[PDB]
Design an enzyme around this catalytic site. Structure first.
Site, mmCIF file in Angstrom:
data_model
loop_
_atom_site.group_PDB
_atom_site.id
_atom_site.type_symbol
_atom_site.label_atom_id
_atom_site.label_comp_id
_atom_site.label_asym_id
_atom_site.label_seq_id
_atom_site.Cartn_x
_atom_site.Cartn_y
_atom_site.Cartn_z
ATOM 1 C CB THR A 197 -1.005 -0.055 1.165
ATOM 2 O OG1 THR A 197 -2.323 -0.037 0.617
ATOM 3 C CG2 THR A 197 -0.871 1.070 2.171
ATOM 4 C CD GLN A 198 1.946 1.663 -3.871
ATOM 5 O OE1 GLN A 198 0.725 1.718 -3.738
ATOM 6 N NE2 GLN A 198 2.528 1.387 -5.027
#
Ligand code: CL
Ligand code: CL
Ligand code: MG
Ligand code: MG
Lengths: 222, 204, 125, 225, 233, 5, 211, 195, 195, 195, 195, 5, 5, 5
Positions: free
Chosen positions: E1-2
């Site tokens: 997740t970014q």
């Protein structure tokens, strides 16, 4: 944060006749208030006279249908080309769905076909693989609009014999394929009027002993 | 937690040839628990009928409020209020509580005494008006009622035919909602006679 | 400052007369003639435009006023008192009726509201 | 979807006829074109109650102002009164309006957002279908449009919203306000979304529904003798 | 997740009688900052496919390398690499679609929306969409980001249904795409005037146009607009 | 819920 | 609403047939009793999928036990297979409230309540009404040991009706089972809509209704 | 909440344990035995989180029973208590700790002495004349501080325990549906029916 | 992107024409240069609603000032803006540049950031796009420039601000304030982009 | 404030010398220009720890590359930086400009923002202070400048960046990369402030 | 939690109310009377938040007693219930709402009929043959749906209420320390000692 | 803190 | 969604 | 959203 799920809308409808079954779905794919496609098929021939639709998150629905199609292929390989019965398909799909119990497939699955006695069959699944055989099932966004209509018009619910004053229920009867298609068309026409995510087109897959045939009808595009 | 689905219940109204119909369920609950099966949601001020779904304390409060307002209207105007005018009064009254609203979904039904024209209307909780020709729905099974009405309804139904259509619309919608049912009432309204029928339905 | 006149300036005299109302009616008597006639298919109201000066543009002074699209008013007596009453009458037609019922008030109820404003100037401090 | 288009001798506003409750269509033929004054009309988007309430309130105060001043009302007056009201409530009154009209000053077209910001244009669009509509307006708009061209452009921009936006649908309402003429309100100017005949009549045989009880309702007053 | 850092905006496309057109502006934005003005977001694969990519540019450059590596790998022990066993648009798409859905399912997505435009062996027009969620769909017209909201409505007035594709010439189709890019420049606060356009025709093959500019813009009417209502000067 | 083009 | 109680004649098992997604009635035709083997029944309450999947899996584990040991699995052993499995998944969000009901020579008529929390309890009567699990019937007044099988069937049927009426999330039809020596017997599906009116007329109860 | 009490008299250990199993507002059972026999002269009562309580007790029971078979010898209560404490002391820093509080009542045949051990879910162990877990512990401690003597007989111990339960019923807000009482002496473990 | 520059003959106000909601350009021909008096103008940045509301009140205050005390000073106009912006700082998002021409004081520029502080400056820049031209403007600004030089300085400055800022764009509007009167200038993309 | 500029004879790297913790200047003589190979250097912005760790690994990778395959290209150095920055994007705060001199390719500049994307550019600016000189640098940069012109362009550019940015300050360090070799330049406040 | 039940028989109304006042894990009293006499033929039972319950009941009692003195007349139970509902309906939208649930049992002397009214803290009112508030509700409701008849005598009503309390004691997890029972008939209000 | 142009 | 007596 | 150079 990153949200791994989405809603692509659409509505699917499975009706089982005496010697046939239908699985219908609108061809509209949406994201928020945007229309992604006016014709993206959602109901698939999976072989062995089985039609399948996984409605909800399109990505999870596409993945599940693929895995089941693959599952049918390996059934033939490992079991001397044995035809996969609808009850066996239904149990297999439960195990596919429950596999991702702690990262669910956000889809409503309906499969239609003939049972081993040659009678029409519809199976309905929840996201985590709870399944049950039914005469009628609507899935997706407009399920709440269509199911009550089907209760009334297919199972003759809250309908009594005139002059009895609620003393004798209307007799249950097997509908012809022609009558069933009318209800499917009227259900989707009604759902299109009152649901923003339903419209554009209707694709119906009819399953008989002779095989799988396909009917398409246009819906309002607003 | 959501005020408009604590008590539960539904109302539906339809127009026919020289007639209107308004119908409601009889359930009042505390969420899952059913408390009363005698909670009628349709009231009448002269020949104008008002159905109210939502938080039951507000249903009762608004009935008492509109009885109050239509009584003073009649004393000053020296005539009964008409459906078109009452619709505007409901809207006015709801929007004056814009930032502290009554958690209700009202429905007006009646025939204009002078023109003889059938009239129905629905409202949201802050008093926006939906004036449909065909039908109005309200309550916890509104989705179900929209589905039933949209397929079952055809225009210019005779009073005795319209009765069957609205009855089958309510009954089949209520049976697909947990917080609706426990009996139902249907009002068939003509220019100068009104028939009220209680329906047999499953009590689960 | 502050309005320290919190008491009535119209009281009953020993004879049971309200002096200030009688004297008001005397002011109306001095006023220019106005009339109204009701027909089967309409009503007419009329008055004389008594121009204070010929240099004055009598068109700019409206003695006959629209209150609502279906209600008109004419007067006899003190013109300024009439002008502020027409302003209050037009407003009360909206605040006490149209903003509630979404239609203009019937003649008798708007009259009732104007009547109420004039009664209050007969009892208020 | 609501648009306003300025033309040679006037201004035209159009709107769709769909109101929604979440994903459900509540009204298939809504009226989003409001009469503030006889020759000042505005199209509203956002909270349906707020747009009706705010146009009716300013419409009332504009009528009283017109009677007080003995002058036909001005669009800038309705615009000023609307924005000062909406600003007071810091966007909590969710009224997004396109205000158009002709007055003694000429023809005017404005948009007003819920927070009380106004802007001036020859072509404006508001609502969820504004981007679909603005796409058509940005493609087909020119200076010195005729009345016929401006109606065509306005209705085409609404159609863009109807087809491509899930928040917009049903019919196209138009109102033409030409200088030195009566404003013509064209309710259901187009009907592109008419429902097809159903396959079946769902009219039930009489006596189908089970009835517990029947009774006459007394709607009449207390009688004489 | 970014979170996406350096990003590309709309990719737009449509089918016409003999092939497909696709276009995208040459900007890499860093939030509100228009940092990179020389970024190519249409990446050709052979002479029959163009992949248009919006979203995170670091993830786009990764996908660019996967496609470059796909061409190399296909050639290995393949005498018909430039003929019957060349990469099809359908093959290139399904590969990306597989990767996109796998990455989302590991909660580490490639933060992109991708449109694969091309012509197949039998001359059939190919046009399909895939994004960071692994969601896929096909339509006579496809667009990402703002394009979906503003481009699609304009392109759908040319090709509204399948039956309109044979009636749509390459000249009409390109005109529609170029107009759509202008509208996006007017109205998208993350768009640039400079863009690339690619045509894949079943007869004339792949035509790749670079350093195109939005022209024939309307601004003259601005001079007549004073204040926000009551101002006259 | 409210009614909301 | 699931009910399992023990009496002289064996075990009575009564369940409703309603499945809900929030306030939406998804189905009125759900089989909440699972036939693990000819002498073993499992009731289901909570997550439909969790109950269906693991009670079907239990039937497999019970079948393997018979093949290996050449003997019918005891209710204690069968219940503990399910209880030990769910305990491994404890805190993962499994939602399961089940009663494992069977007869064996070793133990006689036995009811074991197995919970998604890993609770395993043996008792004469278990009830699951709304979201609460009780060691008492919905009525409990009528419950006497020496009771007729066809009388006991009615109490179970009547008890589900009582809950089905008051509870919004209980309804559809009543499924009845009788567990004895030499297996269980199905006593049919009774639609609550038809059942309510019949029971009202015959018993003279639900007076607060009207019909 | 669950009542588990322990009192060590002159020649025995008595364990009183509530018979009610409650989850939220639901009473799941009114005859529950919150005890396991670890060895012929060692008894463990347990209260805590559903599932963990029984699973922990049965796991401890199996290990002590294995030791008994292998050595043909009974572990001393001191030794059993130390084993139990160490298992709990492991669990606190585990992925999912056992939320179980236990009382261990045993008769040491070598020393001919009764021993009571109170161990909490953290692995906190003390030897006490009397012990308890939960809300009940504070009332019962104050009452036992007054009345308890070291040279009390088993019968005197039962009367004091009887007083504790009576007073707990009046004072406690929840219904624990009575207690089961078990005595641990040289002759072994027996259940007192009359209470 | 907004700026006000004092030169020899008076003051020039410059601004872009873009109004945004998120990444959508709501208005591409916005007029961010607004009249509060005949030769006192302001540049609006921040909330469109807030700046319009503030500008409308200040115009009212100066109209009433003029009725009673004659033409107000640019300092007076800046003070009224400050008073509204400071006293309502909690509820306002408004960055305003006040520019005016007196005959006594000539060209004057006052900048009012978010706080509601006042800063009298030879020239001023504000808005999201201003950050990219701090370096450029500081290196290129001279005092007592000509009209043509000052128009070029603003055109080049905002040209860069528009180029790098997504939130800035459209046409460059300018308003020249001198003894001669009030002149409006417009510069289109095709002109200022090729600079 | 960091920048790399390609000119006729090679490339020049420029940076300020300020390291901050909040508003405290931890180091006022920081060397943000670092050697990864004899004629491949980088400019470090973002986290001091991260950029040092990345630079140390890249120097290792190029030393091992040189041992086996001889002098690496500037493109190769940029690729190794990208690989570390992209694959570890979740855990890294590093904005790096890579500048190098080949004899075949001459002067080359690659910029690697946060994402781990690579952009080959004629010149590049990065860091908090860069935002204020976007306008200035775009207006003043020409291709194929002389050494003296390029040193002036960087000195003036960073001079403005330092002036407007609190996070930039101290001395201006520069490193010249040509065929002639490697030259280090330093410019003190008294010099660059008066520009 | 607190038990308040109401049953309307042929010729009377019976109110059963728990005698326990509990705060958290503490039992504050075991003889509490959760009832107020509003008028000679009207009785109100109340359960809810501490303080609010008594304060609300005594406030209602005072207002009904004031009406009685002023008019020398007894308000009908329908009228008293409507007054109580309206006071609660006011309070929900007040600054701090009364969290009180009430049962109103009354005998209407004009109609010679007993009436039971169930009102919740929101001002939700229904007339019922039998009613209850809280957890005890669902069970008793379903147990009276079976047993209740309209033509039941006061003695039959008490036996059914006796069964409800017995079954509630077994089934309920908390100890409500028995109930106080009061009968409302034509002769007035009396308390049943034996229960 | 953490050192950071 | 999933189904749940 | 809210309009905002
Ligand atoms: Cl503005
Ligand atoms: Cl460092
Ligand atoms: Mg129902
Ligand atoms: Mg500094």
């Amino acid at each position: 944060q990153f949200n791994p799920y989405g809603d692509n809308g659409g509505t699917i409808l499975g009706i089982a006749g005496e010697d046939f079954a239908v699985l219908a779905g609108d061809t509209r794919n949406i994201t928020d208030y945007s229309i992604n496609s006016r014709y993206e098929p959602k109901v698939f021939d999976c072989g062995d006279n089985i039609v399948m639709s996984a409605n909800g998150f399109a990505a999870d629905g596409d993945a599940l249908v693929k895995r089941f199609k693959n599952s049918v292929k390996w059934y033939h390989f490992d079991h001397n080309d044995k035809k996969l019965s609808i009850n066996s398909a239904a149990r297999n799909i439960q195990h596919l769905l429950y596999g991702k119990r702690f990262f669910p497939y956000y889809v409503h699955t309906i499969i239609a076909g003939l049972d081993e006695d040659g009678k029409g069959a519809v199976y309905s699944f929840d996201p985590v693989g709870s399944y049950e055989r039914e005469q009628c099932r609507a899935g997706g966004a407009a399920a709440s609009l269509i199911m009550p209509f089907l209760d009334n018009q297919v199972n003759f619910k809250n309908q009594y014999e005139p002059g009895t004053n609620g003393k004798v229920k209307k007799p249950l009867k097997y509908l012809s394929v022609e009558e069933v298609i009318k209800l499917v068309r009227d259900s989707f026409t009604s759902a299109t009027e009152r649901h923003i995510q339903v419209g554009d087109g209707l694709e119906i897959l009819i399953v008989t002993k002779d095989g799988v045939r396909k009917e398409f009808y246009e819906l309002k595009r607003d | 937690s959501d005020p408009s689905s604590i008590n539960g219940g539904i109302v539906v109204a339809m127009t026919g040839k020289d007639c209107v119909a308004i119908a409601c369920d009889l359930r009042l609950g505390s969420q899952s628990l059913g408390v009363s099966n005698k909670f009628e949601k349709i009231f009448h001020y002269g020949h104008v009928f008002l159905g109210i779904t939502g938080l039951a304390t507000d249903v009762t409060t608004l009935n008492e409020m509109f009885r109050y307002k239509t009584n003073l209207y009649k004393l000053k105007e020296e005539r009964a209020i008409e459906p078109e005018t009452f619709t505007q009064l409901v809207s006015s009254s709801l929007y004056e509580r814009r930032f502290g609203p009554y958690f209700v979904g009202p429905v007006v039904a009646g025939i204009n005494s002078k023109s003889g024209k059938p009239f129905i209307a629905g409202f949201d909780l802050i008093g926006c008006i939906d004036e449909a020709k065909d039908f109005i729905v309200s309550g916890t099974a509104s989705d179900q009622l929209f589905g039933m009405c949209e397929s079952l309804y055809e225009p210019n139904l005779e009073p005795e035919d319209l009765f069957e259509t609205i009855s089958q619309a309510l009954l089949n919608a209520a049976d697909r909602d947990a917080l609706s049912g426990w009996g139902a009432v249907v009002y068939i309204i003509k220019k100068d006679e009104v028939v009220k029928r209680y329906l047999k339905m499953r009590q689960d | 400052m502050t309005d320290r006149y919190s008491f009535s300036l119209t009281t009953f005299s020993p004879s049971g007369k309200l002096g200030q109302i009688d004297y008001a009616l005397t002011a109306v008597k001095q006023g220019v003639t106005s009339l109204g006639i009701k027909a089967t298919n309409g009503v007419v109201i009329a008055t004389e435009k008594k121009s204070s000066s010929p240099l004055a543009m009598s068109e700019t002074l409206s003695k006959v006023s629209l209150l609502t699209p279906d209600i008109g008013a004419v007067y006899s007596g003190m013109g300024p008192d009439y002008r502020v009453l027409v302003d209050k009458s037009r407003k009360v037609a909206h605040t006490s009726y149209k903003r509630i019922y979404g239609e203009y008030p019937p003649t008798k109820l708007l009259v009732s509201e104007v009547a109420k404003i004039m009664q209050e100037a007969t009892q208020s401090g | 979807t609501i648009v306003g288009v300025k033309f040679n001798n006037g201004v035209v506003i159009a709107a769709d006829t769909r109101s929604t409750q979440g994903p459900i269509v509540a009204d298939k033929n809504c009226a989003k074109l409001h009469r503030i004054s006889p020759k000042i009309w505005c199209a509203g988007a956002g909270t349906a109650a707020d747009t009706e309430a705010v146009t009716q309130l300013i419409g009332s105060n504009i009528e009283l102002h017109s009677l007080y001043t003995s002058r036909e009302p001005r669009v800038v007056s309705a615009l000023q009164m609307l924005k000062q009201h909406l600003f007071k409530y810091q966007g909590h009154i969710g009224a997004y309006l396109i205000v158009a009209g002709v007055d003694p000053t000429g023809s005017h077209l404005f948009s007003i957002h819920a927070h009380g910001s106004t802007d001036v244009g020859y072509y404006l669009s508001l609502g969820s279908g504004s981007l679909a509509a603005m796409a058509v307006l940005e493609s087909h708009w020119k200076q010195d449009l005729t009345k016929e061209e401006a109606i065509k452009l306005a209705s085409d921009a609404i159609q863009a919203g109807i087809w491509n936006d899930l928040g917009s649908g049903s019919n196209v309402d138009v109102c033409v306000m030409e200088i030195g003429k009566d404003a013509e309100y064209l309710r259901n100017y187009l009907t592109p979304n008419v429902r097809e005949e159903k396959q079946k009549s769902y009219k039930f045989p009489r006596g189908t529904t089970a009835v517990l009880k029947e009774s006459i309702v007394n709607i009449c007053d207390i009688q004489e003798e | 997740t970014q979170q996406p850092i350096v990003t590309g905006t709309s990719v737009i496309s449509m089918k016409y009688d003999n092939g497909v057109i696709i276009a995208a502006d040459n900007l890499g934005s860093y939030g509100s900052l228009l940092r990179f003005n020389g970024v190519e977001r249409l990446i050709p694969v052979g002479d029959n496919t163009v992949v248009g990519i919006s979203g995170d540019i670091s993830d786009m450059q990764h996908i660019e390398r996967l496609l470059k590596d796909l061409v190399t790998e296909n050639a290995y022990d393949n005498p018909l690499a430039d003929a019957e066993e060349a990469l099809e648009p359908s093959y290139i798409f399904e590969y990306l679609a597989t990767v996109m859905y796998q990455r989302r399912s590991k909660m580490n997505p490639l933060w992109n929306a991708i449109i694969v435009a091309g012509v197949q062996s039998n001359g059939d027009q190919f046009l399909r969409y895939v994004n960071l969620l692994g969601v896929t769909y096909s339509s006579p017209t496809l667009a990402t980001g703002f394009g979906a909201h503003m481009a699609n409505p304009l392109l759908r007035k040319v090709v509204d249904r399948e039956s309109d594709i044979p009636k749509t010439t390459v000249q009409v189709a390109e005109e529609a795409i170029v107009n759509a890019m202008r509208v996006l420049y007017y109205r998208d606060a993350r768009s640039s005037r400079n863009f690339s356009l690619a045509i894949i025709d079943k007869n004339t093959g792949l035509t790749f146009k670079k350093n195109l500019q939005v022209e024939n813009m309307k601004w003259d009417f601005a001079k007549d607009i004073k204040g926000y209502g009551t101002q006259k000067i | 819920x409210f009614l909301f083009x | 609403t699931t009910l399992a109680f023990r009496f002289q004649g064996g075990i009575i098992v009564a369940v409703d047939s309603r499945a809900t997604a929030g306030n939406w009635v998804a189905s009125q035709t759900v089989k909440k009793v699972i036939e693990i083997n000819p002498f073993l029944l499992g009731t289901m309450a909570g997550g439909a999928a969790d109950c269906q999947f693991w009670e079907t899996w239990l039937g497999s584990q019970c079948r393997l036990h018979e093949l290996r040991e050449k003997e019918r699995i005891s209710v204690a052993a069968a219940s503990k297979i399910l209880s030990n499995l769910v305990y491994q998944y404890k805190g993962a969000g499994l939602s399961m409230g089940t009663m494992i009901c069977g007869y064996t020579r070793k133990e006689g008529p036995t009811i074991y309540y197995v919970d998604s929390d890993g609770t395993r309890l043996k008792g004469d009567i278990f009830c699951v009404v709304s979201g609460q699990t009780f060691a008492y019937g919905v009525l409990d007044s009528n419950y006497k040991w020496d009771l007729s099988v066809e009388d006991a069937l009615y109490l179970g049927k009547r008890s589900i009706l009582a809950a089905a009426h008051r509870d919004a999330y209980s309804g559809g039809s009543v499924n009845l089972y009788h567990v004895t020596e030499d297996g269980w017997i199905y006593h049919g599906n009774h639609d609550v809509g038809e059942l309510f009116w019949k029971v009202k007329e015959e018993e003279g109860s639900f007076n607060n209704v009207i019909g | 909440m669950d009542i588990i009490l322990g009192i060590r008299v002159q020649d025995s250990v008595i364990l009183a344990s509530s018979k009610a199993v409650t989850r939220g507002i639901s009473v799941l059972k009114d005859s529950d035995d919150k005890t396991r026999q670890l060895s012929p002269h060692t008894l463990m009562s347990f209260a805590g989180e559903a599932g963990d309580t029984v699973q922990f007790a049965e796991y401890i029971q199996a290990n002590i029973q294995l030791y008994s078979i292998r050595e043909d010898y009974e572990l001393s209560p001191q030794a059993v208590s130390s084993f139990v404490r160490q298992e709990l002391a492991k669990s606190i820093r585990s992925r999912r700790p056992y939320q179980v509080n236990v009382l261990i009542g045993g008769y040491d045949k070598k020393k001919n002495k009764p021993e009571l051990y109170q161990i909490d879910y953290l692995g906190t162990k003390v030897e006490l004349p009397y012990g308890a877990h939960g809300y009940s512990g504070f009332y019962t401690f104050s009452l036992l501080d007054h009345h308890y003597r070291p040279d009390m007989t088993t019968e005197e111990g039962l009367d004091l325990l009887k007083l504790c339960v009576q007073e707990l019923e009046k004072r406690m807000p929840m219904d624990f549906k009575g207690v089961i009482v078990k005595i641990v002496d040289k002759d072994g473990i027996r259940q007192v029916d009359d209470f | 992107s907004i700026m006000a520059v004092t030169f020899k003959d008076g003051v020039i106000l410059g601004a872009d024409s873009r109004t945004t909601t998120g990444a959508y350009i709501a208005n591409r021909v916005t007029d961010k240069l607004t009249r509060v008096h005949d030769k006192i103008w302001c540049c609006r940045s921040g909330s469109a609603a807030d700046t319009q509301a503030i500008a409308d009140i200040v115009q009212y205050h100066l109209e009433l000032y003029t009725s009673q005390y004659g033409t107000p000073s640019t300092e007076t106009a800046a003070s009224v803006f400050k008073e509204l912006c400071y006293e309502n700082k909690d509820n306002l998002t408004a960055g305003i540049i006040v520019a005016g021409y007196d005959d006594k004081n000539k060209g004057e520029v006052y900048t009012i950031p978010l706080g509601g502080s006042v800063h009298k400056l030879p020239y001023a820049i504000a808005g999201s796009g201003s950050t990219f031209i701090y370096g450029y403007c500081d290196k290129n600004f001279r005092e007592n420039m000509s009209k043509e030089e000052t128009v070029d300085f603003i055109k080049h400055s905002l040209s860069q601000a528009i180029k790098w800022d997504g939130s800035s764009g459209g046409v460059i509007r300018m308003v020249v304030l001198t003894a001669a009167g009030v002149e409006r200038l417009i510069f289109y993309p095709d002109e200022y982009e090729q600079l």
